[PDB]
Every structure is written in structure tokens, then in C-alpha cells.
Amino acid sequence: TIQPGTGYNNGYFYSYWNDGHGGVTYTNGPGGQFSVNWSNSGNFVGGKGWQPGTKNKVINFSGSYNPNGNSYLSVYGWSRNPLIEYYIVENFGTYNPSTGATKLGEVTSDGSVYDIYRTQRVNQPSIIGTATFYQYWSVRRNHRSSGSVNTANHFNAWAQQGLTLGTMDYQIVAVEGYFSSGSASITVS
């Protein structure tokens, strides 16, 4: 059970961030496992993965995801030059995290169609401090809390839509919460 920050645990990179609102407990377990239990949290994102990620990694995950309010489960990461924050949402509760974003197209990957969106983040926190950057989204229609994600499918889809990715920074399977409650346990490989 740790406080916000980044580091490595049992062979995997981990990142845990929150807005200073309590109600969140994030725990690193053996291997690629992590568990998050939250009660009336603010905004937070946490999970395990790689640093840096790659543009062709096949990500495997399995677990239990039970949100009660705004929250999502997804492959989450960044790239630099250009600075991009991206998500491959596998599951979510209450509100589609892509809301308000501009839909570009769709991609069929790993047993499901995903809706592709792009949106601009203005003067918001990032891996390099407060900045303006674009977010790329791929939201899975058939929600699941276990499976395999071929990231290359989504990056190629995004590219075909004119969305370009820079040099990859870290890449993880993360659980996010936004003023809600719930719990999750995820094992990445």
C-alpha cells in the first residue's frame, strides 16, 4: 500500500496519482498485480505496466472491476514529441470517459469494435507539467475486465485517422476513479 508516485515493483513499472482528495487505497501486489479500493475519492489514476511502453506490445490483463460511479479500466500511457495522453478503455462505470471528444472512426480489435476519439487538453497536468496536449481514445463497446489488448491495432487505427504518436513514455493498465467509490484488483502481464 503506497502513496502517489512512480517506480518499479516486481518487474513492472507502476504509476499512482491522485488529486489530494482522500478515500483511495492503492496497493502493489506480487508480479504484475495491483489492487485499488476507493470510497468517495476525488480524481485518481493508478496501475502497473512498462516504462517505456512500445508501439506493438500485446498487453494481457485479468481481474475484478467493480466501480460505483465515474471510473474506467484501460491501457493508459503517453508519448513525447508529440506529447500525447492515450487510452484503450476496456471497461468503465457510469460515464463514458470519451464524452465530449470528437469521434474519428472505429476499429475492430481483440473481439470488439472500439470507438475512436480525439480531444484537446488545455493547460492540464501531464508527465511534463501543466501543458496543452491531445488525448487519443479507443473505447471498447463490449466491456470486459479481463483479456488481451494488441496496442498496435489501436495505434495503427489512430494513425490511419491522422493521429500521430511520438516517442513512447510509460504504458500501463490502469484503474481510474472520479468522485465515486468502488474497488478493483488487476494482474497485468
mmCIF file of C-alpha atoms in Angstrom:
data_model
loop_
_atom_site.group_PDB
_atom_site.id
_atom_site.type_symbol
_atom_site.label_atom_id
_atom_site.label_comp_id
_atom_site.label_asym_id
_atom_site.label_seq_id
_atom_site.Cartn_x
_atom_site.Cartn_y
_atom_site.Cartn_z
ATOM 1 C CA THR A 1 0.000 0.000 0.000
ATOM 2 C CA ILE A 2 1.697 3.159 -1.230
ATOM 3 C CA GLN A 3 1.275 6.890 -1.677
ATOM 4 C CA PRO A 4 1.102 8.677 -5.063
ATOM 5 C CA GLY A 5 4.235 8.402 -7.173
ATOM 6 C CA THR A 6 6.038 6.290 -9.746
ATOM 7 C CA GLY A 7 8.572 3.495 -9.521
ATOM 8 C CA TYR A 8 9.092 -0.200 -10.163
ATOM 9 C CA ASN A 9 7.713 -3.197 -8.316
ATOM 10 C CA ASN A 10 8.315 -6.884 -9.014
ATOM 11 C CA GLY A 11 9.490 -6.294 -12.581
ATOM 12 C CA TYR A 12 6.810 -3.791 -13.551
ATOM 13 C CA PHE A 13 6.667 -0.019 -13.749
ATOM 14 C CA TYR A 14 3.893 1.452 -11.644
ATOM 15 C CA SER A 15 2.257 4.851 -11.508
ATOM 16 C CA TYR A 16 -0.229 6.132 -8.952
ATOM 17 C CA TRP A 17 -1.634 9.648 -8.995
ATOM 18 C CA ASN A 18 -4.482 11.441 -7.234
ATOM 19 C CA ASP A 19 -5.769 14.995 -6.749
ATOM 20 C CA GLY A 20 -5.295 15.147 -2.993
ATOM 21 C CA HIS A 21 -8.837 14.018 -2.249
ATOM 22 C CA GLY A 22 -8.765 11.095 0.160
ATOM 23 C CA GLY A 23 -10.752 7.896 0.018
ATOM 24 C CA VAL A 24 -8.234 5.958 -2.075
ATOM 25 C CA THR A 25 -6.081 2.941 -1.168
ATOM 26 C CA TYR A 26 -3.666 1.709 -3.859
ATOM 27 C CA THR A 27 -1.673 -1.490 -3.334
ATOM 28 C CA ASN A 28 1.094 -3.153 -5.344
ATOM 29 C CA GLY A 29 0.963 -6.952 -5.132
ATOM 30 C CA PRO A 30 3.170 -9.810 -6.404
ATOM 31 C CA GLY A 31 4.087 -9.868 -10.081
ATOM 32 C CA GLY A 32 2.022 -7.511 -12.215
ATOM 33 C CA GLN A 33 -0.804 -7.294 -9.681
ATOM 34 C CA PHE A 34 -2.272 -4.218 -8.054
ATOM 35 C CA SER A 35 -5.460 -3.510 -6.123
ATOM 36 C CA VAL A 36 -7.338 -0.282 -5.599
ATOM 37 C CA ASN A 37 -10.201 0.281 -3.190
ATOM 38 C CA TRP A 38 -11.812 3.704 -3.043
ATOM 39 C CA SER A 39 -14.611 5.412 -1.122
ATOM 40 C CA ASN A 40 -15.737 8.888 -2.147
ATOM 41 C CA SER A 41 -12.456 9.669 -3.872
ATOM 42 C CA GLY A 42 -11.579 12.697 -5.925
ATOM 43 C CA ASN A 43 -9.760 12.091 -9.195
ATOM 44 C CA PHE A 44 -7.103 9.345 -9.299
ATOM 45 C CA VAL A 45 -5.327 7.019 -11.747
ATOM 46 C CA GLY A 46 -3.160 4.044 -10.834
ATOM 47 C CA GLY A 47 -1.745 0.868 -12.323
ATOM 48 C CA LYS A 48 1.161 -1.317 -13.441
ATOM 49 C CA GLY A 49 2.922 -1.766 -16.734
ATOM 50 C CA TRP A 50 6.050 -0.698 -18.561
ATOM 51 C CA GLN A 51 8.450 2.220 -18.883
ATOM 52 C CA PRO A 52 8.742 2.855 -21.624
ATOM 53 C CA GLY A 53 5.895 1.148 -23.460
ATOM 54 C CA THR A 54 6.137 0.093 -27.105
ATOM 55 C CA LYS A 55 4.013 0.613 -30.204
ATOM 56 C CA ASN A 56 3.439 -3.118 -30.683
ATOM 57 C CA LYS A 57 3.032 -4.512 -27.165
ATOM 58 C CA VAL A 58 0.344 -7.149 -26.645
ATOM 59 C CA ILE A 59 -0.993 -6.442 -23.160
ATOM 60 C CA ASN A 60 -2.659 -9.144 -21.074
ATOM 61 C CA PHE A 61 -4.810 -8.382 -18.045
ATOM 62 C CA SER A 62 -7.294 -10.159 -15.812
ATOM 63 C CA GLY A 63 -9.133 -9.108 -12.700
ATOM 64 C CA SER A 64 -12.233 -7.891 -10.925
ATOM 65 C CA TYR A 65 -13.566 -4.393 -11.566
ATOM 66 C CA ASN A 66 -16.495 -3.066 -9.573
ATOM 67 C CA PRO A 67 -16.988 0.721 -9.832
ATOM 68 C CA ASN A 68 -19.839 2.683 -8.245
ATOM 69 C CA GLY A 69 -19.783 5.946 -10.178
ATOM 70 C CA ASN A 70 -17.386 7.527 -12.696
ATOM 71 C CA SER A 71 -14.409 5.258 -13.330
ATOM 72 C CA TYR A 72 -12.635 3.328 -16.056
ATOM 73 C CA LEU A 73 -10.228 0.469 -16.760
ATOM 74 C CA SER A 74 -7.851 0.871 -19.594
ATOM 75 C CA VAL A 75 -4.468 0.660 -21.199
ATOM 76 C CA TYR A 76 -3.122 4.117 -20.403
ATOM 77 C CA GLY A 77 0.066 5.887 -21.454
ATOM 78 C CA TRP A 78 1.950 8.799 -23.002
ATOM 79 C CA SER A 79 4.262 9.717 -25.869
ATOM 80 C CA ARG A 80 6.527 12.761 -26.282
ATOM 81 C CA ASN A 81 7.069 14.874 -29.394
ATOM 82 C CA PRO A 82 4.230 14.935 -29.824
ATOM 83 C CA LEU A 83 3.011 14.938 -26.224
ATOM 84 C CA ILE A 84 0.020 12.608 -26.257
ATOM 85 C CA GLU A 85 -2.038 11.010 -23.488
ATOM 86 C CA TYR A 86 -3.872 7.939 -24.758
ATOM 87 C CA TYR A 87 -6.338 5.310 -23.575
ATOM 88 C CA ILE A 88 -7.672 1.964 -24.741
ATOM 89 C CA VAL A 89 -10.709 1.675 -22.483
ATOM 90 C CA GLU A 90 -11.744 -1.917 -21.767
ATOM 91 C CA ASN A 91 -14.350 -1.108 -19.125
ATOM 92 C CA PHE A 92 -15.944 1.795 -17.263
ATOM 93 C CA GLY A 93 -18.776 2.637 -14.906
ATOM 94 C CA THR A 94 -21.425 5.359 -15.100
ATOM 95 C CA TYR A 95 -19.901 7.649 -17.714
ATOM 96 C CA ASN A 96 -18.089 7.046 -20.987
ATOM 97 C CA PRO A 97 -14.707 8.814 -20.454
ATOM 98 C CA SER A 98 -14.736 9.855 -24.127
ATOM 99 C CA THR A 99 -17.764 12.128 -23.611
ATOM 100 C CA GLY A 100 -17.371 15.450 -25.404
ATOM 101 C CA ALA A 101 -14.467 14.194 -27.516
ATOM 102 C CA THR A 102 -14.561 14.231 -31.325
ATOM 103 C CA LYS A 103 -15.202 10.801 -32.837
ATOM 104 C CA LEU A 104 -12.869 9.990 -35.715
ATOM 105 C CA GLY A 105 -13.733 6.428 -36.617
ATOM 106 C CA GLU A 106 -13.848 2.878 -35.326
ATOM 107 C CA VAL A 107 -11.556 -0.117 -35.044
ATOM 108 C CA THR A 108 -12.310 -3.800 -34.578
ATOM 109 C CA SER A 109 -9.746 -5.347 -32.272
ATOM 110 C CA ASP A 110 -9.469 -8.219 -29.835
ATOM 111 C CA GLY A 111 -13.076 -9.347 -30.256
ATOM 112 C CA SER A 112 -14.809 -5.978 -30.275
ATOM 113 C CA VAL A 113 -15.406 -2.727 -32.085
ATOM 114 C CA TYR A 114 -13.877 0.316 -30.411
ATOM 115 C CA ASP A 115 -14.968 3.914 -30.958
ATOM 116 C CA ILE A 116 -12.063 6.243 -31.692
ATOM 117 C CA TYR A 117 -11.956 9.815 -30.392
ATOM 118 C CA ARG A 118 -9.550 12.725 -30.234
ATOM 119 C CA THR A 119 -9.695 15.780 -27.993
ATOM 120 C CA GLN A 120 -7.520 18.626 -26.764
ATOM 121 C CA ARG A 121 -6.430 19.003 -23.156
ATOM 122 C CA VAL A 122 -5.810 22.689 -22.383
ATOM 123 C CA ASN A 123 -3.398 23.777 -19.661
ATOM 124 C CA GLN A 124 -3.781 20.491 -17.722
ATOM 125 C CA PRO A 125 -1.323 18.352 -15.717
ATOM 126 C CA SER A 126 0.904 15.948 -17.668
ATOM 127 C CA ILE A 127 4.128 13.976 -17.484
ATOM 128 C CA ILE A 128 5.968 17.238 -18.198
ATOM 129 C CA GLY A 129 3.938 19.598 -16.018
ATOM 130 C CA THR A 130 0.880 21.710 -16.811
ATOM 131 C CA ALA A 131 0.546 21.748 -20.595
ATOM 132 C CA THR A 132 -1.763 21.647 -23.601
ATOM 133 C CA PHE A 133 -1.817 18.329 -25.460
ATOM 134 C CA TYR A 134 -4.069 15.899 -27.323
ATOM 135 C CA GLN A 135 -5.728 12.794 -25.910
ATOM 136 C CA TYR A 136 -6.444 9.801 -28.136
ATOM 137 C CA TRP A 137 -9.206 7.405 -27.134
ATOM 138 C CA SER A 138 -10.340 3.904 -28.128
ATOM 139 C CA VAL A 139 -13.371 2.803 -26.153
ATOM 140 C CA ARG A 140 -14.400 -0.857 -26.234
ATOM 141 C CA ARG A 141 -18.106 -1.448 -26.878
ATOM 142 C CA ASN A 142 -18.202 -4.851 -25.202
ATOM 143 C CA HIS A 143 -16.955 -4.040 -21.689
ATOM 144 C CA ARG A 144 -14.723 -6.630 -20.033
ATOM 145 C CA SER A 145 -12.379 -6.840 -17.047
ATOM 146 C CA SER A 146 -10.028 -9.481 -18.493
ATOM 147 C CA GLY A 147 -8.397 -10.183 -21.846
ATOM 148 C CA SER A 148 -5.641 -9.208 -24.259
ATOM 149 C CA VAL A 149 -5.019 -5.872 -25.964
ATOM 150 C CA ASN A 150 -2.924 -5.634 -29.107
ATOM 151 C CA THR A 151 -1.933 -1.982 -28.793
ATOM 152 C CA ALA A 152 -0.564 -1.985 -32.353
ATOM 153 C CA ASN A 153 -4.132 -2.365 -33.644
ATOM 154 C CA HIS A 154 -5.183 0.864 -31.949
ATOM 155 C CA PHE A 155 -2.087 2.877 -32.815
ATOM 156 C CA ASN A 156 -2.357 1.903 -36.487
ATOM 157 C CA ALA A 157 -6.080 2.764 -36.410
ATOM 158 C CA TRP A 158 -5.294 6.147 -34.861
ATOM 159 C CA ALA A 159 -2.554 6.753 -37.426
ATOM 160 C CA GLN A 160 -4.922 5.979 -40.314
ATOM 161 C CA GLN A 161 -7.134 8.691 -38.808
ATOM 162 C CA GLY A 162 -4.257 11.166 -38.946
ATOM 163 C CA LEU A 163 -3.417 10.829 -35.260
ATOM 164 C CA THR A 164 0.348 10.670 -34.754
ATOM 165 C CA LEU A 165 2.200 9.241 -31.730
ATOM 166 C CA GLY A 166 5.646 10.385 -30.642
ATOM 167 C CA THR A 167 8.289 8.518 -28.650
ATOM 168 C CA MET A 168 6.551 6.335 -26.061
ATOM 169 C CA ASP A 169 6.822 7.190 -22.389
ATOM 170 C CA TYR A 170 5.292 4.685 -19.946
ATOM 171 C CA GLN A 171 2.390 2.325 -20.697
ATOM 172 C CA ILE A 172 0.141 0.675 -18.107
ATOM 173 C CA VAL A 173 -3.196 -0.977 -17.389
ATOM 174 C CA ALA A 174 -4.810 1.480 -15.011
ATOM 175 C CA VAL A 175 -7.889 1.940 -12.894
ATOM 176 C CA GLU A 176 -9.225 5.493 -12.720
ATOM 177 C CA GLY A 177 -11.834 6.974 -10.442
ATOM 178 C CA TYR A 178 -13.525 10.370 -10.450
ATOM 179 C CA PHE A 179 -15.560 11.302 -7.366
ATOM 180 C CA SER A 180 -17.008 7.847 -6.851
ATOM 181 C CA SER A 181 -16.465 4.634 -4.907
ATOM 182 C CA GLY A 182 -15.593 1.068 -5.803
ATOM 183 C CA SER A 183 -12.775 -1.437 -5.932
ATOM 184 C CA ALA A 184 -10.594 -3.389 -8.321
ATOM 185 C CA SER A 185 -7.831 -5.963 -8.482
ATOM 186 C CA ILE A 186 -5.810 -6.280 -11.688
ATOM 187 C CA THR A 187 -2.944 -8.507 -12.784
ATOM 188 C CA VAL A 188 -1.003 -7.354 -15.821
ATOM 189 C CA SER A 189 1.458 -9.383 -17.901
#
